[PDB]
Amino acid sequence: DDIIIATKNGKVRGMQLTVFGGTVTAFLGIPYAQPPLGRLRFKKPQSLTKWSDIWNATKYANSCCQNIDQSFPGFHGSEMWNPNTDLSEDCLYLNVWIPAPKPKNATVLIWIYGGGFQTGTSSLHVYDGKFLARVERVIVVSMNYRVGALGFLALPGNPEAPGNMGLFDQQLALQWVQKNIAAFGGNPKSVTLFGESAGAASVSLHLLSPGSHSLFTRAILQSGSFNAPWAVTSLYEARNRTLNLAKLTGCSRENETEIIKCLRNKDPQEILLNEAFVVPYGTPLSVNFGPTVDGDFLTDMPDILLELGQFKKTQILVGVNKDEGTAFLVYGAPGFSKDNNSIITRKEFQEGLKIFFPGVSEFGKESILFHYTDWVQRPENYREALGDVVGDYNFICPALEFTKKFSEWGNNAFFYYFEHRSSKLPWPEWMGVMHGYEIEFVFGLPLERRDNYTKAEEILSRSIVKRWANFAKYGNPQETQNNSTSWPVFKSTEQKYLTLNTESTRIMTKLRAQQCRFWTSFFPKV
Amino acid sequence: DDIIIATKNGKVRGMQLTVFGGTVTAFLGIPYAQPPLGRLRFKKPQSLTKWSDIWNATKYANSCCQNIDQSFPGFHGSEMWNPNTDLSEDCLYLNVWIPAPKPKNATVLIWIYGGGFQTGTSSLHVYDGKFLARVERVIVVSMNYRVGALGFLALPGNPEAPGNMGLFDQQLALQWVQKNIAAFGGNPKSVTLFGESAGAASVSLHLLSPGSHSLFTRAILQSGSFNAPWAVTSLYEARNRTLNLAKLTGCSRENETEIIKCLRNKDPQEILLNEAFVVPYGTPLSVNFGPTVDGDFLTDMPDILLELGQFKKTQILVGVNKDEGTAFLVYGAPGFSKDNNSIITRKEFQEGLKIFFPGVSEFGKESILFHYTDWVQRPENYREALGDVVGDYNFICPALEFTKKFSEWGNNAFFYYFEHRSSKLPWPEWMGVMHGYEIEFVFGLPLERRDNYTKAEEILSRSIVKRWANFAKYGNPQETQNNSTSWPVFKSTEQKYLTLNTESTRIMTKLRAQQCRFWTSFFPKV
Amino acid sequence: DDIIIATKNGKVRGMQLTVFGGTVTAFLGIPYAQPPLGRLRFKKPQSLTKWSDIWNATKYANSCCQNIDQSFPGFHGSEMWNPNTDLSEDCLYLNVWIPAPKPKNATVLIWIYGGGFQTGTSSLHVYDGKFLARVERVIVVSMNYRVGALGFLALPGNPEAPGNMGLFDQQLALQWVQKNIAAFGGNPKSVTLFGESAGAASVSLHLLSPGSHSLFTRAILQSGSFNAPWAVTSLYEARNRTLNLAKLTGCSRENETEIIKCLRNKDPQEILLNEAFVVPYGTPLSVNFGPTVDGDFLTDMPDILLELGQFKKTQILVGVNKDEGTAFLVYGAPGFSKDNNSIITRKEFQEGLKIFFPGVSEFGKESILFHYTDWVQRPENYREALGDVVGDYNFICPALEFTKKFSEWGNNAFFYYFEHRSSKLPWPEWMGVMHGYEIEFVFGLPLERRDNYTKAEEILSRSIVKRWANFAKYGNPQETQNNSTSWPVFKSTEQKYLTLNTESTRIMTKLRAQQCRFWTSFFPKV
Ligand SMILES: *[C@@H]1O[C@H](CO[C@@H]2O[C@@H](C)[C@@H](O)[C@@H](O)[C@@H]2O)[C@@H](O[C@@H]2O[C@H](CO)[C@@H](O)[C@H](O)[C@H]2NC(C)=O)[C@H](O)[C@H]1NC(C)=O
Ligand SMILES: *[C@@H]1O[C@H](CO[C@@H]2O[C@@H](C)[C@@H](O)[C@@H](O)[C@@H]2O)[C@@H](O[C@@H]2O[C@H](CO)[C@@H](O)[C@H](O)[C@H]2NC(C)=O)[C@H](O)[C@H]1NC(C)=O
Ligand SMILES: *[C@@H]1O[C@H](CO[C@@H]2O[C@@H](C)[C@@H](O)[C@@H](O)[C@@H]2O)[C@@H](O[C@@H]2O[C@H](CO)[C@@H](O)[C@H](O)[C@H]2NC(C)=O)[C@H](O)[C@H]1NC(C)=O
Ligand SMILES: *[C@@H]1O[C@H](CO[C@@H]2O[C@@H](C)[C@@H](O)[C@@H](O)[C@@H]2O)[C@@H](O[C@@H]2O[C@H](CO)[C@@H](O)[C@H](O)[C@H]2NC(C)=O)[C@H](O)[C@H]1NC(C)=O
Ligand SMILES: *[C@@H]1O[C@H](CO[C@@H]2O[C@@H](C)[C@@H](O)[C@@H](O)[C@@H]2O)[C@@H](O[C@@H]2O[C@H](CO)[C@@H](O)[C@H](O)[C@H]2NC(C)=O)[C@H](O)[C@H]1NC(C)=O
Ligand SMILES: *[C@@H]1O[C@H](CO[C@@H]2O[C@@H](C)[C@@H](O)[C@@H](O)[C@@H]2O)[C@@H](O[C@@H]2O[C@H](CO)[C@@H](O)[C@H](O)[C@H]2NC(C)=O)[C@H](O)[C@H]1NC(C)=O
Ligand SMILES: *[C@@H]1O[C@H](CO)[C@@H](O)[C@H](O)[C@H]1NC(C)=O
Ligand SMILES: *[C@@H]1O[C@H](CO)[C@@H](O)[C@H](O)[C@H]1NC(C)=O
Ligand SMILES: *[C@@H]1O[C@H](CO)[C@@H](O)[C@H](O)[C@H]1NC(C)=O
Ligand SMILES: *[C@@H]1O[C@H](CO)[C@@H](O)[C@H](O)[C@H]1NC(C)=O
Ligand SMILES: *[C@@H]1O[C@H](CO)[C@@H](O)[C@H](O)[C@H]1NC(C)=O
Ligand SMILES: *[C@@H]1O[C@H](CO)[C@@H](O)[C@H](O)[C@H]1NC(C)=O
Ligand SMILES: *[C@@H]1O[C@H](CO)[C@@H](O)[C@H](O)[C@H]1NC(C)=O
Ligand SMILES: *[C@@H]1O[C@H](CO)[C@@H](O)[C@H](O)[C@H]1NC(C)=O
Ligand SMILES: *[C@@H]1O[C@H](CO)[C@@H](O)[C@H](O)[C@H]1NC(C)=O
Ligand SMILES: [Cl-]
Ligand SMILES: [Cl-]
Ligand SMILES: [Cl-]
Secondary structure (H helix, E strand, O other): OOOEEEEEOEEEEOEEEEOOOOEEEEEEEEEOOEOOOHHHOOOOOEOOOOOOOEEEOEOOOOEEOOOOOOOOOOOHHHHOOOOOOOEEOOOOEEEEEEEOOOOOOEEEEEEEOOOOOOOOOOOOHHHOOHHHHHHHOOEEEEEOOOOHHHHHOEOOOOOOOEOOHHHHHHHHHHHHHHHHHHHHOEEEEEEEEEEEOHHHHHHHHHHHOHHHHOOOOEEEEEOOOOOOOOOOEOHHHHHHHHHHHHHHOOOOOOOHHHHHHHHOOOOHHHHHHHHOOOOOOOOOOOOOOOOEOOOOOOOOOHHHHHHOOOOOOOOEEEEEEOEOOHHHHOOOOOOOOOOOOOOOOHHHHHHHHHHHOOOOOHHHHHHHHHHHOOOOOOOOHHHHHHHHHHHHHHHHHHHHHHHHHHHOOOOOEEEEEEOOOOOOOOOOHHHOOEOOOOHHHHOOHHHOOOOOOOHHHHHHHHHHHHHHHHHHHHOOOOOOOOOOOOOOOOOOOOOEEEEEOOOOOOEEEOOOHHHHHHHHHHHHHO | OOOEEEEEOEEEEOEEEEOOOOEEEEEEEEEOOEOOOHHHOOOOOEOOOOOOOEEEOEOOOOEEOOOOOOOOOOOHHHHOOOOOOOEEOOOOEEEEEEEOOOOOOEEEEEEEOOOOOOOOOOOOHHHOOHHHHHHHOOEEEEEOOOOHHHHHOEOOOOOOOEOOHHHHHHHHHHHHHHHHHHHHOEEEEEEEEEEEOHHHHHHHHHHHOOOOHHHOOEEEEEOOOOOOOOOOEOHHHHHHHHHHHHHHOOOOOOOHHHHHHHHOOOOHHHHHHHHOOOOOOOOOOOOOOOOEOOOOOOOOOHHHHHHOOOOOOOOEEEEEEOEOOHHHHOOOOOOOOOOOOOOOOHHHHHHHHHHHOOOOOHHHHHHHHHHHOOOOOOOOHHHHHHHHHHHHHHHHHHHHHHHHHHHOOOOOEEEEEEOOOOOOOOOOHHHOOEOOOOHHHHOOHHHOOOOOOOHHHHHHHHHHHHHHHHHHHHOOOOOOOOOOOOOOOOOOOOOEEEEEOOOOOOEEEOOOHHHHHHHHHHHHHO | OOOEEEEEOEEEEOEEEEOOOOEEEEEEEEEOOEOOOHHHOOOOOEOOOOOOOEEEOEOOOOEEOOOOOOOOOOOHHHHOOOOOOOEEOOOOEEEEEEEOOOOOOEEEEEEEOOOOOOOOOOOOHHHOOHHHHHHHOOEEEEEOOOOHHHHHOEOOOOOOOEOOHHHHHHHHHHHHHHHHHHHHOEEEEEEEEEEEOHHHHHHHHHHHOOOOHHHOOEEEEEOOOOOOOOOOEOHHHHHHHHHHHHHHOOOOOOOHHHHHHHHOOOOHHHHHHHHOOOOOOOOOOOOOOOOEOOOOOOOOOHHHHHHOOOOOOOOEEEEEEOEOOHHHHOOOOOOOOOOOOOOOOHHHHHHHHHHHOOOOOHHHHHHHHHHHOOOOOOOOHHHHHHHHHHHHHHHHHHHHHHHHHHHOOOOOEEEEEEOOOOOOOOOOHHHOOEOOOOHHHHOOHHHOOOOOOOHHHHHHHHHHHHHHHHHHHHOOOOOOOOOOOOOOOOOOOOOEEEEEOOOOOOEEEOOOHHHHHHHHHHHHHO
16 A cells, blocks of 8 residues: 555556544546647647556646746745646646545545636645545545636637636546546545635536536535626627737737637747736736636526526535735735735725726726725724725625525525634734635644644634535534534525634624625616 | 538538628528328328438528418518418428527527418518527527418318318427437527417417427417417318318318318319308408317317316416507408508497407497497597407407416416517508517517617617527526516416516506406307 | 245245234244354455255344343343343344235334344344234344444454444345345335334434435334434544453554454453453443444444434334333442332432443532432432433433434424333332333234233233334324324424323323433533
8 A cells, every 4th residue: 555546547546644643545646638738728628548557646736827926925925825836738637635544435525726717726735635534534636727818718619719628627627526536435426516716616607507517516615606706708808808819929810710820839938928918907806818608618698597597406605704805905006015004095095996996987986985985083994995895896795696696596505704814824914814814724724733723723623624524415514513503594585694713603694785785786887 | 611410311501691790500491391292282291201412401491382461562561471482382391590600509499480370481581580599599490381271171080181280390390300409509408489479379289289298398479379269270160161162172072081182182272262261251360271179289179278287387478469459450340441540430340340250149249349448539449449359359368368377387477568669660650569560579680780670679679589588598588687677477366467668668467457357258158 | 835935045944833823934043144253253244145955944043142141040020131042153144024824015124132232132032023923914024133342343444343243234134135025025115124222223323324225114213212322432432442352352463453363363252251341430331332433334423414314214203111211220220129129318329320420520420410309208219310310311312302303304203102011020110111121012922812911901012013013014103993092293393202001192292301401402511
């Protein structure tokens, strides 16, 4: 041991790891599709022709091409999200963590990484399945999927650049688990997708894709949903951007297919560079190349499918963090530094609004100003206001609204409001419970003793881990043993959600009702 | 392209068309059965023996034999409904419009043309599927089916003239789509029939035929339903008429089969001529040769099947136009011209009644007079009254009552009251929102810019097109994106329907409750 | 006759027996697995390689290894439970009683014997299926399964001593009935498990095991349920005990598998001897080697599975006896003899508590004292109090609570409170309606005329037999013919149960509500 699994594609060697005085077998870097190179760039992921021999699956594989956030070189806070393996066009691999001893029929969890469809990789320390396998005895799988232009370049209906390639990657990863996980003792019949930010959005898209209906069982959505403003691109911009990219690399043409031929020949880095520029103005949140209505993976605008109950029927767990917005302020909002406590002026608030809502009518920005700056004298007012604006508009509202409309079609849905600030959080107090900073608690990182999270925090993680685990296994996110708070189903009438924190978890109603009325009812009209 | 599809019968070449700066592939004139000639006249449609080679499907096929309305030669208003291809006994072809690029799993719409089972053809400009394919990205199919004696000559249980042949045509067209549409990327599992007048009535008959149960998914019924007075013929008249036709062409006999032998030998035109005469007196609405209880396609009187829940269970969309009746006044009601504004006298009203209800007891006509001429002094009174009489009795009531009884068996049904007068309507103001004059808005004709419908009208059509499209795809006729009125389900209790027009669409209750009580409860008894 | 059945394993000869002037065919001692010897000790039961020839199945087979209760040598009361055939490692056989004449499609009852997973055998006189076959014309099957260390030695995940072997025995017995009972005219589709004490607990475990889902139909649970304090062992003690046993027989080691190798070589009796000693202190109720969460038969802690509806959905019949506790007092509670009427002092009561709750905090024992000794002056007070304590805590509460949570997931459940003292009961009046002393009435022993139960008692048994029989056959424990009390469904709200006794059976609510609140809500926290 020496431990080999016989996948319907070939053999793969794992590697034992120690976890809290236990063994977990890790299979890192298994290829699930055929490297999408040269002639395959911009295409749907291709079948894997069975390899002969043993695949040594003992190091994370190459992350996919992407730009790297370099606002704060050396800063953990920002860098912990940067890829930690070689960027490459060759990146369609996935990881599996089965607990040891090999389990009989384990529920499988599949992770999908966030990062605006532009950045991300499964190999991040915060996405380490090894703990979940150890503690809740499930199999955890994660995959890498193409991002930015390379994964979502869209030339509508044109099979050369049909769009949503990254999404199809994910899907092929699901098929893989479908055909193989049993060999590791996984139960293909009990599969729960979960992701965060674009990850969550992807999870939600899978609920809508018929292609995915049967590739999984349940779904968890952490800070994100397709109906978020940043998540889907109109078939119009999709084109404008594909063309803009073409111009920007001297690839303009007559035969459309030729433009793809052209681009198929540029250097990854030359593409990665211009991506930033295919829109007139951008935001800290610009998702330049994302999912589109391709009439393949997505068969119609998804708000319509959601609206009219056209999606997998099953339970869902959904939730957000107390301060989704803050993380972004520091990438362009005048007055905001990660270093000063970023008190800003009314004048600057107006300024911040211009940054996050570039194309929005002057009236539109006025309404936002008006709704959020109706003060309850206090210095931080405008600072926090702009936070919530971004928070509420990009994450918390579309999140809530998805949950709402989904449960209307008769399914159980649970909602959480995560409101705990890791005490090891490298960013400043004021950014509060930040976007993406619950992931570590979900993957159970605080369970690691020599790690310096607090006792409070170890407990919390242990609880969440269980709730999630349970939700995966039985479609019910209860913690039944340590006298916990019962987590109520989210009905479209009363709209209850559970708060997650180290003190007391409480049951509450109608999260951000006031604000989301504005974002949901009024603002789409300006 | 050059674009060939490989049907389970042979190959067929389509033809690209430009539509609002887009391509749609049209396959016009595909044969779906084996020409019903000489020995096959009056029989059920026969299997198509696979052809060798390529079928060029690039012009509409022959319309089927029928008489032609010649009240108003040169008048668009009446002539737009006349066949626009060669009449022929050889006419069992169908059209398909798939949007381009070829879609993956498109919902299919099948059109069935109206015209009292006596007239009609799929090739009419107003039945042009090319727009629907373009705009809502569905596949549209329409077929021609035998009409008048040639399609509904009934000699009950006699396999030579078993009746309902035209209906079986339609059905074979459905089987065709069932076996083939996938090759064009159609999804046989999501098929919605829709039709108008006799078309609608046919749609409704298919809900009752077991032979059709599995050949489609949903149903739309525009101004018509089997339970309409004109729609089904008693097994008695069916015979009286088959014999009368025989006498009228010197075909009378002893061996019944011989009468068919005889008639199988006359010239189409000789049959078409006498059709008009097989009844003692007729009306502008006489459907001389129609669907009968053949114990094959219809297995029992259909009002009983409807009454006792014996039909496909599924959603239905049903509706009528504000002025169904007027169109007919001008083909015999004394005082009515398309040219003068047709004010008529009480004496003439009585006269009109005689025309539309020939066989009805003197008392019967008195009740009608009495119920409708209870004035609210105004000149047009009697004119409008006679309109509604015909409207309410032939269309609006049986329409409503069908919906009612159908939804009682637990299915979702939606009802519309179409009340907009095309501004390009060749008939006079007084005829108002006329019978058959919503078809063009359903097929999206006003979407064509250089066409001179109003802006109001383009919007409306765009809306209807969507609602229909949606209803086809998801069984829900909502327009979810442009802040529209929600279209309520039609319950047998509250009876809500949605009004369709250019100003505001409203939700209302109990369409023509007063009048339909009379037509439904009282009149069948006189 | 001479009567041979052709099992998918070989032939087996039965033996006619006379029963109330009738014949019943008994097939005693059929092997259902391959003797678990030497190399197979501690393993899951192994397939039976088809034997050639006829198996004479005409005497009960060997009981399995176990210790023998020798507190009261010669006393029927205690000895009637001791094994009545040779103890042997070779003991995987089962009995079948089919009524004669061979029935067509009889409902099958499978008995599972109690005895703390430490003791028991199917051959006991009180488990004699011959009467049930005769009277209710069903097939009764019972099996022997490994007990104590030999059947539940657990070395978690280690396939050498994977734990729950006895449980798997039972399961293999169920598979057997599944594959074969038809040959005896049994209907594999209508199979009801029933058992008592550990038997019941086992029945309940089968409701949770997916491995068993499809091996039976309904379930009856007499004085016992997995959620009883004595029924499942934590994966921690399971190990501590496997090691302690190792030390105690000089079997300690490095390679775990070696410890099994070691133990695989000791003499049964050497193992049986030390079993008593693997815990620090014990109780009259100590179930030293029992079912554990093996992640095979049990796939997760069972309270969680029960809590979250993860079990076979089907009807259940559950119940307890009026005085479950008394039976145990006499194996260690100071003051209690089966010979004096065992009045005890407050000081002794405290003393008794120490015996039954050894590890429990001083506070914990105080609460018990406090809750139960709040007197209503009467001498027996403390005597009865300590009885109920043991009764309520080990049996009646966990019994009730199981029923409650089970019915919450939408299944019909019936509850009985058996409160009749056999007049042939060898123990003293004060022990009242004792643990295990309804079994004889269920198997219909009082139906035997020359047997000296009373008339009252014959009736009662006849009634129970019927109710059970009915419950097995139709999932409804009614006695429909002799004007009986209707037995209400047990809802989680009103909690009705039926009392069983010779006078009048009554419908009552909320059995031991006061006390079980304490045991269920408060005590798990001390
Ligand atoms: C679609 O793109 C056009 C062109 O974008 C420009 O050229 C690209 C290659 C890239 O370099 C971008 O940064 C450029 O902006 C857009 O037209 C531009 O944007 C606005 C028009 O609203 C205008 O201020 C700029 O001057 C235009 N650029 C030039 C020089 O033409 C346009 O925004 C996009 N179309 C829509 C409506 O989405
Ligand atoms: C808060 O800090 C921001 C960010 O400035 C950077 O970080 C600070 C710690 C400090 O070291 C600055 O010098 C760094 O540049 C300040 O934003 C700057 O403000 C002035 C105008 O007021 C302007 O000249 C800079 O270009 C600004 N930088 C940007 C791009 O916003 C801000 O003023 C500080 N606010 C307070 C009052 O604390
Ligand atoms: C069935 O038909 C008879 C005969 O119809 C007539 O002959 C046909 C060939 C055709 O030429 C029709 O126009 C003729 O009317 C019907 O009997 C006639 O109708 C009424 C009787 O109610 C009477 O006024 C006519 O004189 C009859 N014609 C003759 C000359 O016999 C009759 O209406 C039909 N039967 C029923 C009850 O439906
Ligand atoms: C309305 O018009 C009808 C239809 O008549 C035809 O069209 C008119 C525009 C006019 O040009 C007529 O001459 C055309 O014949 C009139 O109906 C006629 O009325 C008279 C008796 O009053 C009669 O001699 C004709 O035969 C009728 N035609 C028929 C078959 O109905 C009608 O009188 C006009 N009504 C008014 C007052 O406007
Ligand atoms: C697990 O077992 C240890 C050891 O049990 C002892 O040795 C066994 C072979 C057997 O002979 C037992 O009877 C022995 O008790 C337990 O430790 C003992 O129990 C308590 C500690 O709580 C203490 O009073 C004894 O002295 C310990 N025995 C010795 C001499 O070490 C212990 O109870 C078990 N562990 C747990 C926490 O369950
Ligand atoms: C009730 O009897 C118990 C059990 O004692 C045995 O059975 C009795 C019938 C009698 O014959 C005893 O001698 C037998 O030993 C008595 O328990 C004993 O009590 C005394 C102390 O009071 C003690 O010396 C013994 O060891 C005890 N035995 C045990 C292990 O409990 C009890 O005293 C009797 N109680 C009364 C008052 O009836
Ligand atoms: C794969 O890696 C392992 C590392 O221990 C080794 O046993 C084996 O030789 C390797 N096989 C190769 C060289 O591919
Ligand atoms: C695993 O569990 C499922 C139940 O969801 C079952 O159907 C499947 O056959 C099991 N496979 C095994 C026996 O491991
Ligand atoms: C409950 O808390 C106990 C500590 O008392 C711990 O052992 C266990 O892991 C906890 N369970 C969960 C699900 O948090
Ligand atoms: C069918 O029609 C098309 C028209 O372009 C042509 O390409 C082809 O030759 C035709 N085949 C024949 C003659 O049937
Ligand atoms: C098309 O869609 C249906 C779902 O209604 C599906 O069952 C069918 O297999 C699909 N065919 C494809 C994959 O195109
Ligand atoms: C909604 O209206 C917009 C114009 O603002 C138009 O682009 C779109 O087609 C409309 N949608 C429907 C379904 O009418
Ligand atoms: C089995 O036992 C019966 C007892 O009557 C007898 O008929 C038969 O000979 C026996 N067969 C043997 C010896 O195994
Ligand atoms: C016995 O009864 C079952 C009904 O539960 C039936 O399905 C099965 O085929 C029967 N076998 C026979 C005919 O004995
Ligand atoms: C009902 O009582 C009668 C005696 O009157 C008896 O024959 C019969 O067995 C009884 N039935 C049951 C189910 O006890
Ligand atoms: Cl808050
Ligand atoms: Cl009106
Ligand atoms: Cl009691």
